[PDB]
Design a protein around this ligand. Structure first.
Ligand SMILES: O=C1CNc2cc(Br)ccc2N1
Length: 112
């Protein structure tokens, strides 16, 4: 496949995913000022802005690795936060809704 169409597809998929983050709690790195003990539990932080940066740095050359970092956004949040928190439920919703976005984008990818 050709790189340029693939990357415009990842750009579109990334904005579709970011759209699901209505609370805007995944679109920027978790502020270590608000959450000082965060990197004590979270080995690799991830967020949609970082993903965009990674995309443009050509770090995503297949959907698996793109999807890998999205999954980090979700799993980091499930790991750090108690089940009874808004944050945890947000991550579950993102897993669900983002999963559907990803399945479709992958389908368009398979077409390529
Ligand atoms: O796990 C998280 C996801 N994002 C976030 C943003 C702020 Br602001 C504060 C805490 C978190 N924790």
């Amino acid at each position: 496949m050709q790189l340029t169409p693939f990357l415009i597809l990842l750009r579109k998929t990334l904005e579709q995913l970011q759209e699901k983050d209505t609370g805007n709690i995944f679109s920027e790195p978790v502020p270590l000022s608000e959450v000082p003990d965060y990197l004590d539990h979270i080995k690799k932080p991830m967020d949609f802005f970082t993903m965009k940066q990674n995309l443009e740095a050509y770090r995503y050359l297949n959907f698996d690795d793109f999807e890998e970092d999205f999954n980090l956004i979700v799993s980091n949040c499930l790991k750090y936060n108690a089940k009874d928190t808004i944050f945890y439920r947000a991550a579950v919703r993102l897993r669900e809704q983002g999963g559907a976005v990803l399945r479709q984008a992958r389908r368009q990818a398979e077409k390529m």
